[PDB]
C-alpha cells in the first residue's frame, strides 16, 4: 500500500539480515542488493520466502544502481568496515536518481561525530564521518543511527558463554559503562526510524535504560544466571594502548575498539543533545529486549558468536 519501498545494501550481513527481517515484518516492500558470488544463498532463499526482492549485482554497476534507486524510497546501508567509502557509489546513484526520501549510512555503532578513539579505530570512524559530510553537502535526507553495542555479539565476545573456562578476561578496570542492544531490535527499530518524521535529518541513538551495564556487572549477573563463579583476569589499559601501536593491521583494530567501548566507555560518555533522538522513547508498542532477557536467551538458546570484518 502506502508503505515506503526499502532498499538494503549488505542485507545478508550480520546486522543487515535483521533489518531485512524487520522491514518485511513491518510490511515494507523490501529489496536486498547482494553480490553474484555471495555464499549467503540459503539466507537469500529465506529472505525470498519472506517476501524480499533479491537483486544481484556489484556496487560498481552505476547504471544498475540508478535504475534500482528510481524504484525505491528509502535506502539503508549495512556494509562492513572495508566497504565504508564504497558507499560513495551508493550515494552517487542516490544523487542521480533524485527520488530517495531517506538514506541511512552504515553507522550502527558509536556516535562518531562526538567521540574520538585510538588511531586504528579513529581512521575507520573518520571514513564514516566522510560519508556523513558528503550526505549533508548534497542535501540528501538522512538518519544517522548510533546503535551502540550489538548485544549477542559482545555477550559472546565478553562472556564466551560457549566456553567452559573458569576465568574471564576483563578489559581495563571493567567499571566503564556501555549500552548494548539485541540485534533483532536494532533491526526493527532501524526500519521504524527510517520512515519516522521525528528521525528525519537527525541522529538517533539506541540507549534504553534497561541496557546499560559495566563489564563487572555483566559478569556478576551471568554468574548468578548459571550458578558459576569466574576468576577475573584484567588487561591493563596501558597494555591495550601499547598493542594498538605495535600490532599490525587489522589485528590492532579490535583492540582499539575494545578500548573505546569498554575502557573509555564511549557509548555512555556523553549526554544527549537538544536534537538527538533516543529511540526507546519513540514507540509505546515496542521495547528493546533487556539485558536480563538477553542473558536468559543465552541460557536457553544462545546465538552463535561472530567476528566483524576488518
Ligand atoms: N555496534 C556494534 O557492536 C557493531 C558490531 C559489528 C558491526 N558493526 C557495524 O555494523 C555495520 C555492518 O557490519 P556487519 O558485521 O554486519 O557487516 P558484514 O556482515 O561483515 O557484511 C555485510 C555485508 O557486506 C557485503 N559485502 C562483503 N564484502 C563485500 C565487498 N567486497 N563488496 C561489496 N559488498 C560486500 C556482504 O553481502 P553480500 O555477500 O550479500 O554481497 C555482507 O553480508 C558496520 O557499519 C559495522 O561497523 C557494529
Numbering used by the authors: 5 to 314
Pull verbatim passages from the article behind this deposition.
Structurally, the PIP-family proteins organize around an N-terminal, Rossman-fold domain, containing a core, six-stranded parallel β-sheet flanked on each face by an α-helical layer. In summary, a mechanistic scheme emerges in which binding of the coniferyl acetate substrate within the active site of EGS leads to deprotonation of the p-hydroxy group (PUSH) coupled with expulsion of acetate ion from the C1 substituent (PULL).
The monoclinic structure also contains two EGS/NADP+ complexes per asymmetric unit and was refined at 1.6-Å resolution resulting in crystallographic R-factors of 0.210 and 0.229. Intruigingly, in the monoclinic structure of unliganded EGS-NADP+, a nitrate anion from the crystallization medium occupies the site of the bridging water molecule, and may mimic the hydroxide ion that develops during the catalytic reaction. The structures of EGS complexed with NADP+ or NADPH provide the first structural characterization of nicotinamide-cofactor binding by the PIP family of enzymes (previous crystallographic analyses had yielded only apo-enzyme structures). The cofactor is bound through a large number of polar and non-polar interactions. In contrast, the anti-conformer of the nicotinamide ring observed in EGS is consistent with the class-A reductase (donation of the pro-R hydride) activity of the PIP-family enzymes. Detailed inspection of the hydrogen-bonding network involving the ε-amino group of Lys132 suggests that this group exists formally in the unprotonated–NH2 state and is the donor in hydrogen-bond interactions with the 2′-hydroxyl group of the nicotinamide-ribose and the backbone carbonyl oxygen of residue 110. With an available lone pair of electrons, the amino group can serve as the acceptor in a hydrogen bond with the bridging water molecule, and most importantly, thereby act as a general base.
